Amino acid sequence: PNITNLCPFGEVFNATRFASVYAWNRKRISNCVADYSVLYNSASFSTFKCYGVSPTKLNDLCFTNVYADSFVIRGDEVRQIAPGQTGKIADYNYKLPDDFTGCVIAWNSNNLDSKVGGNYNYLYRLFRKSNLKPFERDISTEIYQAGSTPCNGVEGFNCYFPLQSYGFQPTNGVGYQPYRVVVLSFELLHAPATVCGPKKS
Amino acid sequence: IEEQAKTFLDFFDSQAEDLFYQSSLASWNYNTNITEENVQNMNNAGDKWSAFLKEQSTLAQMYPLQEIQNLTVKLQLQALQQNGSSVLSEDKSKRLNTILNTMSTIYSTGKVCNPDNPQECLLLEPGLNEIMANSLDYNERLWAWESWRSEVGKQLRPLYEEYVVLKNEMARANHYEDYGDYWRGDYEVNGVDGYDYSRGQLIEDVEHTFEEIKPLYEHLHAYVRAKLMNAYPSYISPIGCLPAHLLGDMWGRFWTNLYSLTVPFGQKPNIDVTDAMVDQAWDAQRIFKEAEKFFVSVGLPNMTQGFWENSMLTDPGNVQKAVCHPTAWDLGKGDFRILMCTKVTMDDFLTAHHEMGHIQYDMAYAAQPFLLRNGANEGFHEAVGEIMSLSAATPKHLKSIGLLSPDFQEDNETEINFLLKQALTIVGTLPFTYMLEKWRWMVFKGEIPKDQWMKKWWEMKREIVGVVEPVPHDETYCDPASLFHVSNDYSFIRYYTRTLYQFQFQEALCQAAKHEGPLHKCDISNSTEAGQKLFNMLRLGKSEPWTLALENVVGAKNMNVRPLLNYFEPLFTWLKDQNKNSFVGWSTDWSPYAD
Numbered sequence: 185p186n187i188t189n190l191c192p193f194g195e196v197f198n199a200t201r202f203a204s205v206y207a208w209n210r211k212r213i214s215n216c217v218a219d220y221s222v223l224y225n226s227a228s229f230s231t232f233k234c235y236g237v238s239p240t241k242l243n244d245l246c247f248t249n250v251y252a253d254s255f256v257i258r259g260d261e262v263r264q265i266a267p268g269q270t271g272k273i274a275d276y277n278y279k280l281p282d283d284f285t286g287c288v289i290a291w292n293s294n295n296l297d298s299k300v301g302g303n304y305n306y307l308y309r310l311f312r313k314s315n316l317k318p319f320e321r322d323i324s325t326e327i328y329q330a331g332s333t334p335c336n337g338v339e340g341f342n343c344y345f346p347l348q349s350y351g352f353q354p355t356n357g358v359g360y361q362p363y364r365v366v367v368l369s370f371e372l373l374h375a376p377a378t379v380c381g382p383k384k385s
Numbered sequence: 386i387e388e389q390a391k392t393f394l395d396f397f398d399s400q401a402e403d404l405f406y407q408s409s410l411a412s413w414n415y416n417t418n419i420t421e422e423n424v425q426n427m428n429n430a431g432d433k434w435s436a437f438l439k440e441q442s443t444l445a446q447m448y449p450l451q452e453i454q455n456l457t458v459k460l461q462l463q464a465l466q467q468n469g470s471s472v473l474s475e476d477k478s479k480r481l482n483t484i485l486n487t488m489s490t491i492y493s494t495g496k497v498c499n500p501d502n503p504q505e506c507l508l509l510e511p512g513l514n515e516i517m518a519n520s521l522d523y524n525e526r527l528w529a530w531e532s533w534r535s536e537v538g539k540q541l542r543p544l545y546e547e548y549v550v551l552k553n554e555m556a557r558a559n560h561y562e563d564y565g566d567y568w569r570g571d572y573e574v575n576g577v578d579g580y581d582y583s584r585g586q587l588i589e590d591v592e593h594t595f596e597e598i599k600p601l602y603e604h605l606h607a608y609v610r611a612k613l614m615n616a617y618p619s620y621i622s623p624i625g626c627l628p629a630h631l632l633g634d635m636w637g638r639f640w641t642n643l644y645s646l647t648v649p650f651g652q653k654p655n656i657d658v659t660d661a662m663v664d665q666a667w668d669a670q671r672i673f674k675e676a677e678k679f680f681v682s683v684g685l686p687n688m689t690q691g692f693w694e695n696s697m698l699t700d701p702g703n704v705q706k707a708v709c710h711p712t713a714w715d716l717g718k719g720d721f722r723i724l725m726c727t728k729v730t731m732d733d734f735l736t737a738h739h740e741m742g743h744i745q746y747d748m749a750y751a752a753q754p755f756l757l758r759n760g761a762n763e764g765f766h767e768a769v770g771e772i773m774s775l776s777a778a779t780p781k782h783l784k785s786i787g788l789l790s791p792d793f794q795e796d797n798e799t800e801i802n803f804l805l806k807q808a809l810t811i812v813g814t815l816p817f818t819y820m821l822e823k824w825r826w827m828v829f830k831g832e833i834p835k836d837q838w839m840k841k842w843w844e845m846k847r848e849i850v851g852v853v854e855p856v857p858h859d860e861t862y863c864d865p866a867s868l869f870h871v872s873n874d875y876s877f878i879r880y881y882t883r884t885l886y887q888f889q890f891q892e893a894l895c896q897a898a899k900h901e902g903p904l905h906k907c908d909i910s911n912s913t914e915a916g917q918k919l920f921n922m923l924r925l926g927k928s929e930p931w932t933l934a935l936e937n938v939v940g941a942k943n944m945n946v947r948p949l950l951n952y953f954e955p956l957f958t959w960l961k962d963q964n965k966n967s968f969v970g971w972s973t974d975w976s977p978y979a980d
């Protein structure tokens with residue numbers, strides 16, 4: 185049993201660009217041989233938070249889809265990407281379920297994403313009228329109403345545009361530096377052979 | 386209505402946390418490279434930040450404070466709902482700005498000449514201060530002193546005559562009785578049960594405390610007078626006020642330059658370890674690393690990577706115009722830096738501890754909402770920086786870290802010389818700060834008529850400080866105008882309150898560290914109980930009443946002089962034993978020009 189249809193994890197962790205957290209990407213991975221060891225033994229990541237599966241089991245486990253969600257956040261917000269958490273990201277930019285089966289992997293991208301003068305290309309949602317469900321994505325740009333009036337869709341007294349940019353700069357201190365986050369969500373529906381660890385004899 | 390107000394403040398941070406950072410960096414860049422490009426950039430960024438505050442403030446004012454139950458939101462709203470600038474009409478605003486820029490200019494460009502020797506034309510802060518510091522020539526010192534009053538003081542006076550009206554009108558527009566009352570609002574606590582402090586309370590606490598300080602001052606004053614009379618044998622009366630021009634500075638603010646005349650035991654060496662640093666091949670980096678070790682040893686965080694990579698620790702290595710008066714920076718977004726030009730000497734060693742103490746305070750409250758990221762009140766940033774320096778300077782510390790020889794022996798006479806130098810620095814300045822603010826408050830309040838400003842200025846200096854003018858100047862003069870803090874619109878009482886806080890902190894932390902000796906021998910290095918005790922306050926920023934925040938560390942809701950007196954009691958004891966052949970206290974009738 186030799187293996188060559190390996191999973192494209194080498195792209196998604198290593199991408200030219202990541203999505204804004206308010207509009208996070210969802211990469212579906214299926215029909216492939218995984219080898220998670222190149223992630224867990226990497227010194228490039230600062231964070232490996234596993235809630236379901238673990239670094240010592242994954243190399244030998246099968247799943248029907250693995251989903252690599254990906255986005256850019258401010259470093260202080262890394263702690264919100266977890267089951268059981270709250271806060272502006274956990275509540276409405278990117279929510280993980282309390283029974284999340286996977287692992288959250290993250291790293292500092294200050295030398296990739298920060299720019300002198302401010303990299304404002306990464307947006308986060310400042311406001312919603314409700315919290316998000318796990319793996320829900322909300323990309324509406326309508327004006328957020330805080331007052332008694334919708335004010336006809338303009339910024340104004342108790343009227344706010346819900347998406348604000350992170351002012352990322354190479355000189356910001358740690359916690360104000362950008363971080364790249366990839367979340368591996370795992371599921372087993374119908375045919376587990378669709379994603380598996382390595383094959384032998 | 387906090388449904389709207391907290392939402393507004395979340396939007397506020399979403400803009401403010403960036404615009405302040407752009408303004409902040411432009412200011413930094415200017416100071417590290419002084420050039421027209423940076424001047425225009427800091428001015429432009431400055432205006433953007435100011436305009437943003439004005440717009441934002443206008444919106445904050447929609448949300449009445451009386452609707453707000455949540456104190457954190459109420460405090461944040463109070464901070465940006467302040468009216469201040471633009472409460473007055475545009476012409477009044479422009480006129481006041483014109484006056485203030487004019488005052489600053491007259492002070493900073495106020496080049497004074499010697500009519501008998503034109504080569505002596507100088508500004509105060511380069512070279513003319515050397516005459517006031519170090520000359521022992523009574524008449525040379527007088528020429529310098531009088532020349533600043535006649536060439537700078539008189540010229541600023543008419544700006545004060547109009548200024549106090551414009552500032553009081555502003556203060557009234559902001560619902561304060563006068564501008565002195567406006568400034569005193571910094572210490573106000575209002576709406577927190579058990580921690581309240583009215584603005585007028587500061588006056589009572591300052592006056593009450595000062596009366597308790599006086600005995601220490603009177604004995605120090607008598608000692609200094611006894612010594613200055615040998616230096617100036619035909620000029621100083623044994624029972625009178627000291628001449629102002631003989632106190633070591635242009636206004637007599639500190640008595641540190643009198644040390645060379647007053648040293649108790651002149652046969653003894655100092656604990657100046659500049660040579661140790663030089664002989665041991667220290668550099669600026671070593672000095673800051675030793676200061677870092679000091680703070681981490683008590684449980685404080687280390688400096689950030691940014692600090693070590695982009696701070697300015699030394700002067701430029703080329704002919705580069707830059708300003709590096711030592712200062713700590715919090716540039717926003719967790720960017721902390723120090724700016725100074727460190728030389729390998731004991732004064733810069735202590736300065737590094739002072740400035741890093743300010744940075745540690747700034748790091749501690751970095752977690753507060755943007756508008757609460759400040760010290761508990763205006764005197765706390767320095768109270769914290771001063772205790773870090775005060776502890777670093779004690780011989781126990783210096784010997785332990787290799788600056789004093791292993792064979793160094795501290796003795797009876799060394800202690801006295803040490804305490805006197807500090808008393809001249811501290812005790813000798815408390816009456817200056819006290820007197821100046823009392824006078825300015827009385828001026829803003831309208832208690833002192835504009836035709837009686839100098840009459841009371843000098844009467845008060847003789848009654849409170851015990852200093853007398855060499856020249857019976859009339860009302861065309863304005864002595865306090867000639868001082869930087871007055872010409873540049875700063876509150877001054879912060880130094881009084883800071884000094885008292887400094888000693889309350891040192892004593893509380895020294896006890897936390899379980900020290901077994903005299904207060905002046907305290908070293909809380911490598912002691913985490915004291916470090917955590919202070920940290921727990923530093924982290925609060927403006928989120929708590931300063932009275933509460935202070936209680937948490939020192940066991941008091943107010944200022945307390947006892948720690949100061951306890952710090953200097955061994956000196957006082959010596960000063961009481963001294964002066965058995967002299968008079969303690971002074972008259973206010975006698976003057977150096979009397980005849």
Ligand SMILES: *[C@@H]1O[C@H](CO)[C@@H](O)[C@H](O)[C@H]1NC(C)=O
Nearest residue numbers: 193194195197198222223228
């Ligand atoms: C990403 O690219 C680097 C390039 O040095 C490589 O070492 C690494 O194995 C790649 N894959 C991942 C998942 O990081």
Ligand SMILES: *[C@@H]1O[C@H](CO)[C@@H](O)[C@H](O)[C@H]1NC(C)=O
Nearest residue numbers: 417418419420422423701705
């Ligand atoms: C002088 O100002 C310029 C701005 O163009 C800056 O690039 C340069 O580094 C500054 N010089 C120093 C010594 O910082």
Ligand SMILES: *[C@@H]1O[C@H](CO)[C@@H](O)[C@H](O)[C@H]1NC(C)=O
Nearest residue numbers: 387453454455456457458459
């Ligand atoms: C102020 O905000 C804090 C945030 O935790 C909250 O706990 C507190 O209850 C609020 N104040 C009031 C009176 O609700």
Ligand SMILES: *[C@@H]1O[C@H](CO)[C@@H](O)[C@H](O)[C@H]1NC(C)=O
Nearest residue numbers: 442466467468469470471472
């Ligand atoms: C101060 O408050 C008054 C109250 O009406 C308001 O009109 C004024 O514009 C405020 N001024 C500033 C400069 O915020």
Ligand SMILES: *[C@@H]1O[C@H](CO)[C@@H](O)[C@H](O)[C@H]1NC(C)=O
Nearest residue numbers: 680681682684685686687688
């Ligand atoms: C700060 O970082 C340095 C890096 O060498 C470390 O040695 C020191 O113990 C750290 N201090 C704290 C308080 O973590």
Ligand SMILES: *[C@@H]1O[C@H](CO)[C@@H](O)[C@H](O)[C@H]1NC(C)=O
Nearest residue numbers: 649650796797798799801959
């Ligand atoms: C020096 O030590 C001696 C010990 O006998 C003491 O009597 C003397 O008063 C001390 N000197 C001073 C200045 O106190």
Ligand SMILES: *[C@@H]1O[C@H](CO)[C@@H](O)[C@H](O)[C@H]1NC(C)=O
Nearest residue numbers: 682781782785786908910911
């Ligand atoms: C630093 O802490 C150590 C802990 O043993 C102590 O031995 C040393 O004397 C302390 N140094 C200073 C300067 O207090």
